[PDB]
């Protein structure tokens, strides 16, 4: 395995999800303010 | 200072990049489809 491994993974895993599901709310939030 | 590094960030430094601007459109696509 890695050197860190659950150390890093412990804030890479649940961070790229965060920013993946953060983008979608950005999404819809600009096309429910379209109209 | 590690096995990748090199071949690793050529391929996640943009990848984090593409990840939010195509979530974002996803999220924008379905908002559009709301009301």
């Known amino acids: 395995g ?3 491994s ?3 993974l412990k804030v890479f895993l ?3 999800l965060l920013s993946h599901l ?3 709310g ?3 939030y600009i096309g429910r ?3």
Chains 1, 2 share one sequence.
Request: hydrophobic share 60%; glycine share 12%; aromatic share 12%.
């Open 2 to 4: 890695g050197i860190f």
């Open 22 to 24: 953060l983008a979608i």
């Open 14 to 16: 649940p961070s790229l």
């Open 26 to 28: 950005l999404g819809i």
């Open 6 to 8: 659950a150390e890093f």
């Open 33 to 35: 303010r379209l109209t």
